[PDB]
Design an enzyme around this catalytic site. Structure first.
Site, PDB file in Angstrom:
ATOM      1  N   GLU A   1       2.738 -10.326  30.673  1.00 42.30           N
ATOM      2  CA  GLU A   1       1.258 -10.613  30.357  1.00 42.30           C
ATOM      3  C   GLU A   1       0.783 -11.312  31.761  1.00 42.30           C
ATOM      4  O   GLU A   1       1.193 -12.494  31.794  1.00 42.30           O
ATOM      5  CB  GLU A   1       0.811 -11.314  29.214  1.00 42.30           C
ATOM      6  CG  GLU A   1      -0.787 -11.394  28.957  1.00 42.30           C
ATOM      7  CD  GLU A   1      -1.131 -12.305  27.741  1.00 42.30           C
ATOM      8  OE1 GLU A   1      -0.708 -11.803  26.679  1.00 42.30           O
ATOM      9  OE2 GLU A   1      -1.981 -13.105  27.822  1.00 42.30           O
TER      10      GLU A   1
ATOM     11  N   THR B   1       4.997 -23.565  35.549  1.00 39.08           N
ATOM     12  CA  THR B   1       4.856 -23.450  37.243  1.00 39.08           C
ATOM     13  C   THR B   1       3.534 -24.047  37.290  1.00 39.08           C
ATOM     14  O   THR B   1       2.679 -24.398  36.512  1.00 39.08           O
ATOM     15  CB  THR B   1       4.678 -22.060  37.411  1.00 39.08           C
ATOM     16  OG1 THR B   1       3.402 -21.528  36.983  1.00 39.08           O
ATOM     17  CG2 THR B   1       6.157 -21.267  37.181  1.00 39.08           C
ATOM     18  N   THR B   2       3.175 -24.481  38.708  1.00 35.53           N
ATOM     19  CA  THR B   2       1.644 -25.070  39.088  1.00 35.53           C
ATOM     20  C   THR B   2       0.518 -24.303  38.815  1.00 35.53           C
ATOM     21  O   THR B   2      -0.366 -24.818  38.596  1.00 35.53           O
ATOM     22  CB  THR B   2       1.808 -25.288  40.559  1.00 35.53           C
ATOM     23  OG1 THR B   2       2.130 -24.135  41.271  1.00 35.53           O
ATOM     24  CG2 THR B   2       2.901 -26.510  40.940  1.00 35.53           C
TER      25      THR B   2
ATOM     26  N   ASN C   1      -6.706 -13.704  19.811  1.00 33.50           N
ATOM     27  CA  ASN C   1      -5.919 -14.986  19.455  1.00 33.50           C
ATOM     28  C   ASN C   1      -6.913 -15.875  18.522  1.00 33.50           C
ATOM     29  O   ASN C   1      -8.350 -16.012  19.019  1.00 33.50           O
ATOM     30  CB  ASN C   1      -5.671 -15.572  20.896  1.00 33.50           C
ATOM     31  CG  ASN C   1      -4.895 -16.781  20.767  1.00 33.50           C
ATOM     32  OD1 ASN C   1      -5.016 -17.622  19.931  1.00 33.50           O
ATOM     33  ND2 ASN C   1      -3.736 -17.186  21.684  1.00 33.50           N
TER      34      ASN C   1
ATOM     35  N   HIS D   1      -5.848 -14.453  29.682  1.00 33.46           N
ATOM     36  CA  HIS D   1      -6.434 -15.754  29.558  1.00 33.46           C
ATOM     37  C   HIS D   1      -7.674 -15.999  30.487  1.00 33.46           C
ATOM     38  O   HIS D   1      -7.711 -15.500  31.485  1.00 33.46           O
ATOM     39  CB  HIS D   1      -5.370 -16.595  30.190  1.00 33.46           C
ATOM     40  CG  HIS D   1      -5.699 -18.173  29.949  1.00 33.46           C
ATOM     41  ND1 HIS D   1      -5.658 -18.549  28.768  1.00 33.46           N
ATOM     42  CD2 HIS D   1      -6.102 -18.998  31.063  1.00 33.46           C
ATOM     43  CE1 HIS D   1      -6.081 -19.896  28.854  1.00 33.46           C
ATOM     44  NE2 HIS D   1      -6.309 -20.205  30.274  1.00 33.46           N
ATOM     45  N   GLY D   2      -8.535 -16.734  29.833  1.00 33.28           N
ATOM     46  CA  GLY D   2      -9.923 -17.110  30.263  1.00 33.28           C
ATOM     47  C   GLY D   2     -10.852 -15.782  30.179  1.00 33.28           C
ATOM     48  O   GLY D   2     -11.862 -15.709  30.712  1.00 33.28           O
TER      49      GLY D   2
ATOM     50  N   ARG E   1     -11.600 -31.270  11.076  1.00 34.53           N
ATOM     51  CA  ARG E   1     -12.162 -31.955  10.243  1.00 34.53           C
ATOM     52  C   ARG E   1     -11.080 -31.919   9.098  1.00 34.53           C
ATOM     53  O   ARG E   1     -11.102 -32.796   8.102  1.00 34.53           O
ATOM     54  CB  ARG E   1     -13.261 -31.174   9.540  1.00 34.53           C
ATOM     55  CG  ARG E   1     -13.828 -31.766   8.242  1.00 34.53           C
ATOM     56  CD  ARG E   1     -14.305 -33.190   8.686  1.00 34.53           C
ATOM     57  NE  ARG E   1     -15.292 -33.305   9.708  1.00 34.53           N
ATOM     58  CZ  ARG E   1     -16.821 -33.296   9.253  1.00 34.53           C
ATOM     59  NH1 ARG E   1     -17.056 -33.195   8.215  1.00 34.53           N
ATOM     60  NH2 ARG E   1     -17.750 -33.602  10.157  1.00 34.53           N
TER      61      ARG E   1
ATOM     62  N   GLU F   1       2.781 -16.327  20.324  1.00 35.16           N
ATOM     63  CA  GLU F   1       3.017 -17.239  21.594  1.00 35.16           C
ATOM     64  C   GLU F   1       3.753 -18.377  21.089  1.00 35.16           C
ATOM     65  O   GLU F   1       3.354 -19.058  20.524  1.00 35.16           O
ATOM     66  CB  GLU F   1       1.566 -17.382  22.413  1.00 35.16           C
ATOM     67  CG  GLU F   1       0.722 -16.230  22.764  1.00 35.16           C
ATOM     68  CD  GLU F   1      -0.301 -16.381  23.437  1.00 35.16           C
ATOM     69  OE1 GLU F   1      -1.183 -17.623  23.425  1.00 35.16           O
ATOM     70  OE2 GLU F   1      -0.957 -15.529  24.031  1.00 35.16           O
TER      71      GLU F   1
ATOM     72  N   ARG G   1      -1.112 -28.717  17.969  1.00 36.18           N
ATOM     73  CA  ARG G   1      -2.508 -28.957  18.303  1.00 36.18           C
ATOM     74  C   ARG G   1      -3.396 -28.209  17.321  1.00 36.18           C
ATOM     75  O   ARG G   1      -4.491 -28.450  16.836  1.00 36.18           O
ATOM     76  CB  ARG G   1      -2.689 -28.662  19.776  1.00 36.18           C
ATOM     77  CG  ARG G   1      -4.015 -28.618  20.231  1.00 36.18           C
ATOM     78  CD  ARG G   1      -4.037 -28.040  21.454  1.00 36.18           C
ATOM     79  NE  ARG G   1      -3.544 -28.871  22.552  1.00 36.18           N
ATOM     80  CZ  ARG G   1      -3.192 -28.626  23.813  1.00 36.18           C
ATOM     81  NH1 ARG G   1      -3.138 -27.375  24.194  1.00 36.18           N
ATOM     82  NH2 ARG G   1      -2.619 -29.407  24.579  1.00 36.18           N
TER      83      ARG G   1
ATOM     84  N   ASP H   1      -6.392 -18.933  17.872  1.00 37.99           N
ATOM     85  CA  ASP H   1      -6.035 -20.404  17.928  1.00 37.99           C
ATOM     86  C   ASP H   1      -7.426 -21.223  18.089  1.00 37.99           C
ATOM     87  O   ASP H   1      -7.243 -22.540  17.571  1.00 37.99           O
ATOM     88  CB  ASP H   1      -5.380 -20.793  19.438  1.00 37.99           C
ATOM     89  CG  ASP H   1      -3.998 -20.120  19.590  1.00 37.99           C
ATOM     90  OD1 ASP H   1      -3.485 -19.911  18.629  1.00 37.99           O
ATOM     91  OD2 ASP H   1      -3.632 -20.272  20.859  1.00 37.99           O
ATOM     92  N   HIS H   2      -8.381 -20.741  18.251  1.00 33.14           N
ATOM     93  CA  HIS H   2      -9.735 -21.580  18.411  1.00 33.14           C
ATOM     94  C   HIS H   2     -10.208 -21.775  17.055  1.00 33.14           C
ATOM     95  O   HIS H   2     -11.318 -22.713  16.867  1.00 33.14           O
ATOM     96  CB  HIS H   2     -10.714 -21.252  19.635  1.00 33.14           C
ATOM     97  CG  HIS H   2      -9.962 -22.000  20.930  1.00 33.14           C
ATOM     98  ND1 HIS H   2     -10.751 -23.037  21.599  1.00 33.14           N
ATOM     99  CD2 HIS H   2      -8.878 -21.562  21.614  1.00 33.14           C
ATOM    100  CE1 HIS H   2      -9.868 -23.198  22.497  1.00 33.14           C
ATOM    101  NE2 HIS H   2      -8.765 -22.702  22.593  1.00 33.14           N
TER     102      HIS H   2
ATOM    103  N   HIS I   1      -0.799 -19.012  18.937  1.00 33.31           N
ATOM    104  CA  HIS I   1       0.042 -19.993  19.846  1.00 33.31           C
ATOM    105  C   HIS I   1       0.478 -21.092  18.888  1.00 33.31           C
ATOM    106  O   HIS I   1      -0.510 -21.908  18.698  1.00 33.31           O
ATOM    107  CB  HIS I   1      -0.370 -20.439  21.144  1.00 33.31           C
ATOM    108  CG  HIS I   1       0.505 -20.995  21.869  1.00 33.31           C
ATOM    109  ND1 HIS I   1       0.116 -21.698  23.056  1.00 33.31           N
ATOM    110  CD2 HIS I   1       1.666 -21.609  21.628  1.00 33.31           C
ATOM    111  CE1 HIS I   1       1.057 -22.084  23.650  1.00 33.31           C
ATOM    112  NE2 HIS I   1       2.332 -22.175  22.807  1.00 33.31           N
TER     113      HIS I   1
ATOM    114  N   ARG J   1       2.248 -24.188  18.890  1.00 30.71           N
ATOM    115  CA  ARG J   1       2.680 -25.129  19.876  1.00 30.71           C
ATOM    116  C   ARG J   1       3.654 -26.064  19.065  1.00 30.71           C
ATOM    117  O   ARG J   1       3.375 -26.521  18.142  1.00 30.71           O
ATOM    118  CB  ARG J   1       1.489 -25.772  20.418  1.00 30.71           C
ATOM    119  CG  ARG J   1       0.460 -24.938  21.412  1.00 30.71           C
ATOM    120  CD  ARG J   1      -0.550 -25.669  21.948  1.00 30.71           C
ATOM    121  NE  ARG J   1      -0.358 -27.160  22.388  1.00 30.71           N
ATOM    122  CZ  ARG J   1      -0.077 -27.015  23.767  1.00 30.71           C
ATOM    123  NH1 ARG J   1      -0.046 -26.051  24.603  1.00 30.71           N
ATOM    124  NH2 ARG J   1       0.518 -28.211  24.361  1.00 30.71           N
TER     125      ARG J   1
ATOM    126  N   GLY K   1      -8.969 -14.773  23.210  1.00 29.09           N
ATOM    127  CA  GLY K   1      -9.178 -15.905  22.030  1.00 29.09           C
ATOM    128  C   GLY K   1     -10.568 -16.521  22.267  1.00 29.09           C
ATOM    129  O   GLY K   1     -11.396 -16.456  21.415  1.00 29.09           O
ATOM    130  N   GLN K   2     -10.549 -17.391  23.184  1.00 28.94           N
ATOM    131  CA  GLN K   2     -11.522 -18.635  23.437  1.00 28.94           C
ATOM    132  C   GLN K   2     -12.882 -17.930  23.217  1.00 28.94           C
ATOM    133  O   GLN K   2     -13.914 -18.323  22.629  1.00 28.94           O
ATOM    134  CB  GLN K   2     -11.315 -19.538  24.300  1.00 28.94           C
ATOM    135  CG  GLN K   2     -11.986 -20.723  24.259  1.00 28.94           C
ATOM    136  CD  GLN K   2     -13.380 -20.641  24.705  1.00 28.94           C
ATOM    137  OE1 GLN K   2     -13.724 -19.721  25.831  1.00 28.94           O
ATOM    138  NE2 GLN K   2     -14.124 -21.635  24.361  1.00 28.94           N
TER     139      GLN K   2
END
Lengths: 259, 259
Positions: free
Chosen positions: A149, A100-101, A8, A212-213, A19, A70, A49, A10-11, A43, A45, A234-235
């Protein structure tokens, strides 16, 4: 057998948008992912973002790789997916109504079924980003998803808390300020649950991804879950790339997920 | 003779703050800058957008390198500078009251003189981040600054517009949507002015730095200005690091500024 790695980007777009001078260039990065990874994930969005519609257009037109978009359930981005036709769409939540929470997609959303329908009718593979719960896995099967996923975020945070210095830093999660014995038990439970969920997905004929993470430390127990066939990360790869460069960051991750 | 390179690590903190998992680790990055660069630069903004007070503390306590803190005139960050004592403070604007229309510090600010006084009394070297104007250079001499840093941003944007594809991208600057002949003349004028300003600074006994917006293409004409002794560069080096890793990104920049 062999785990697939979706990278991913994205980052990389996060840096670029910071910049606004087109640097780093996301299409350049995509070429690297195309070569060294198994799929390019991004992703787009609704709030734009990081990754932008032009990134999706350019990557689809220029890169030799499957693309995993995504996106959420808004018409704007679904229409773009229908027009540009990435290989796969992974439905992820953005709005309160989709969330969801625990961060997985709300599988009761009133537009989810028709959204899946439209994408599949356009010959786009559909993955649902879901909390790791047996009930959501069954709901995903009912919704006719090919792919799920599993949301590894809570697993990742628990691993970080137990096996890194994060609790001593400004980035410590207040929710995880708990005695270590309790955290160890929660970690074991969450990891066990990931494995059970992957098994269930496979039993129902779904393809199971995760990611994720995930980082170069907490990934290792996840690799041991045979039933997960793909990771989208990704990150942590972008964070490693600052030190080693993106090609090497990808190749290092590929070496960890050999089994 | 030999140009000094300060590496601003702010955009590494941008990545870190984006996900809040202490990755990339800024102290790790600082160790690399310490070794391969000539000074570590960071801007601890009042709004804590990227680099944080703990970063300044940790870098001063742990890294073998001069430190250049960029900061504004707020008491909170000035007090922190007075307590921690970086080698140098470069005063940069954040608030409307500190800003000029071109982005340099407002040298008429009611607290600037006493701010310089307090820092110099604490044996901290003071640089003023200024628009490249002869009048501001003279004002900086009057304010007793040792160092000035010329704002190369407008030069950088003009170079990008003339010698890259940026005008064809979503990052094109509407202000620079002008015929090429006009842009070429503006570029020549802005570059000439940089040289004249550096000469004036040196004539007045100031040390002259530069560096905002500088990248691996637009830096080259700036290197030819003999009177500039130091460049502070961040965003372009971080952007290159995604591809090559930070050590190599720094070393590549060092090779360009050899003269």
């Amino acid at each position: 057998n062999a785990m697939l790695l979706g990278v991913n980007i994205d980052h990389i777009a996060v840096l670029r948008q910071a910049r606004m001078v087109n640097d780093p260039d996301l299409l350049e990065a995509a070429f690297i992912v195309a070569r060294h990874g198994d799929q390019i994930t991004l992703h787009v969005r609704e709030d734009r973002r990081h990754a932008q519609d032009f990134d999706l257009e350019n990557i689809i037109k220029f890169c030799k790789s499957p693309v995993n978009l995504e996106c959420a359930l808004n018409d704007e981005i679904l229409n773009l997916a229908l027009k540009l036709k990435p290989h796969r769409v992974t439905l992820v939540p953005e709005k309160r109504e989709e969330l969801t929470t625990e961060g997985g997609l709300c599988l009761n959303h009133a537009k989810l079924k028709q959204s899946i329908e439209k994408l599949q009718n356009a010959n786009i593979e559909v993955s649902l980003f879901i909390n790791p719960s047996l009930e959501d896995i069954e709901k995903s099967k009912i919704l006719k998803a090919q792919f799920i996923e599993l949301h590894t975020g809570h697993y990742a945070n628990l691993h970080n808390a137990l096996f890194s210095n994060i609790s001593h830093t400004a980035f410590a999660l207040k929710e995880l300020d708990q005695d270590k014995k309790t955290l160890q038990a929660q970690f074991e439970k969450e990891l066990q649950n990931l494995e059970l969920c992957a098994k269930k997905g496979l039993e129902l004929g779904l393809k199971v991804a995760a990611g994720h993470g995930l980082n170069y430390k907490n990934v290792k127990p996840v690799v041991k879950i045979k039933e997960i066939c793909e990771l989208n990360i990704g990150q942590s790869i972008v964070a490693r790339s600052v030190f080693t460069g993106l090609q090497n960051a990808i190749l290092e991750m590929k070496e960890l997920i050999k089994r």
